[PDB]
Design a binder for this molecule. Structure first.
Ligand SMILES: Cc1cc2nc3c(=O)[nH]c(=O)nc-3n(C[C@H](O)[C@H](O)[C@H](O)COP(=O)(O)O)c2cc1C
Ligand SMILES: COC(=O)c1cccc(NS(=O)(=O)c2cccnc2Nc2ccc(Cl)cc2Cl)c1
Ligand code: SF4
Ligand SMILES: [Mg+2]
Length: 350
């Protein structure tokens, strides 16, 4: 009862994935070895989030903890944890391709990119910024494919021109994620068109893609593939186990845009530390992990009421009262929790 897929394999750099589908990276601790390993086993691109890896297995692999938080960027972005996450994912998926997702705004971005390459990533995905120096840190890892997340055709042109002038290389792909002209059905064609100036770089559409109908819409607009996160957030294999319990009663009213210490908006569930901020009992802010450069070691966290490293870390640890919980706008459509296998079958059959 599942017709062979008519979707065709997607080549990114030297890497081929069976289905033109990325499971979007999700931190902290949402897309680690069980999720990304099982996604890649099923033939989509599993993506490991490289942010906050110091939290992995309750801070098993860090060198220093202060106040139950990984101490500084070197422990918050823990190379030893990252190595173990990748190794555990490949116990599930073998040599099927795996990405690492690294936000450009993090402190020590270049170290974490090199760490991801050494951990065995085949692909690096980077948004939250304009990542003009991505290949600077990968010179030892030429065959690792490099993919910026962009929200405009202008960004593609600036990136191709700056990479080409400095590295004589251009990106292997672009993920287009909107932040009426920022509607994905308008944005993707504009980016695909602009890409032709540089040699038809595959374009991956992301944001609000729920089912095969959405996938086919994006493909027919010139996208080479899609990236989906919220659907995989509703799988059993999600490494942050709170979401399987929280999502099936989530109502659309409980999803809101919030400011963040990174200087970009996030979409959050009105629960955990978000609820603590309205009640006035939220935790004190005291920058320990120094997670992102735009925060200025607590300046913006104090302004928006929460520390995103602490809050996302607490969610991975199962903390319902003070954790920070993210969702795409479609999160209210998660009515059951299903397996990654069953999800991939629903997205690819026919
Ligand atoms: C819980 C959660 C965590 C996320 N974390 C990251 C992240 O660490 N890095 C990143 O580039 N995008 C992150 N995103 C965005 C997703 O990777 C993805 O591009 C977007 O949510 C796709 O839209 P969809 O959820 O409608 O499919 C996150 C999204 C969610 C819901
Ligand atoms: C369709 O898209 C959505 O609805 C959606 C919903 C939620 C988040 C995102 N994007 S995001 O990259 O996660 C992000 C955006 C703004 C501020 N912060 C982060 N992330 C982050 C920062 C620091 C650390 Cl330490 C860890 C992480 Cl995960 C997108
Ligand atoms: S205070 Fe700011 S920089 Fe420090 S860990 Fe929290 S969000 Fe990151
Ligand atoms: Mg529902």
């Amino acid at each position: 009862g599942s017709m062979v897929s008519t979707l065709k394999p997607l080549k990114i750099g030297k890497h081929t994935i069976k289905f033109p589908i990325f499971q979007g990276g999700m931190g902290v601790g949402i897309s680690w070895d069980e999720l990304a390993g099982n996604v890649a086993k099923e033939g989509a691109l599993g993506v490991i989030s490289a942010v906050g890896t110091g939290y992995y297995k309750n801070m098993r692999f860090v060198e220093r903890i202060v106040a139950k938080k990984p101490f500084e960027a070197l422990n918050f972005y823990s190379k030893k944890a990252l190595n173990e996450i990748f190794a555990n994912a490949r116990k599930i998926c073998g040599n099927n391709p795996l990405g690492a997702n690294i936000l450009y705004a993090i402190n020590d971005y270049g170290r974490v990119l090199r760490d991801s390459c050494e951990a065995g990533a085949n692909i690096i995905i980077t948004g939250a910024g304009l990542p003009t120096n991505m290949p600077e840190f990968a010179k030892d890892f030429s065959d690792v494919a490099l993919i910026p997340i962009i929200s405009s055709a202008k960004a593609l042109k600036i990136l191709c021109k700056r990479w080409s002038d400095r590295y004589k290389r251009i990106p292997d792909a672009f993920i287009v994620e909107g932040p009426e002209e920022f509607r994905l059905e308008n944005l993707v064609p504009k980016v695909v068109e602009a890409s032709k100036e540089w040699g038809n770089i595959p374009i991956i559409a992301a944001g609000g893609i729920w089912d095969r109908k959405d996938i086919d819409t994006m493909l027919s607009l010139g996208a080479s593939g899609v990236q989906m996160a919220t659907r995989f957030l509703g799988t059993k294999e999600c490494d942050a186990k709170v979401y399987a319990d929280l999502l099936p009663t989530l109502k659309k009213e409980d999803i809101l845009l919030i400011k963040s210490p990174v200087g970009y908006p996030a979409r959050a569930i009105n629960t955990g530390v978000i609820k603590r901020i309205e009640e006035g009992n939220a935790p004190k802010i005291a920058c320990v992990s120094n997670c992102v450069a735009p925060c200025n070691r607590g300046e913006e966290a104090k302004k928006v009421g929460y520390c995103i490293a602490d809050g996302l870390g607490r969610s991975y640890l199962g903390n319902r009262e003070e954790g920070l919980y993210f969702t795409g706008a479609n999160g209210y459509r998660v009515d059951k929790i299903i397996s990654v296998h069953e999800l991939i079958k629903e997205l690819t059959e026919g």
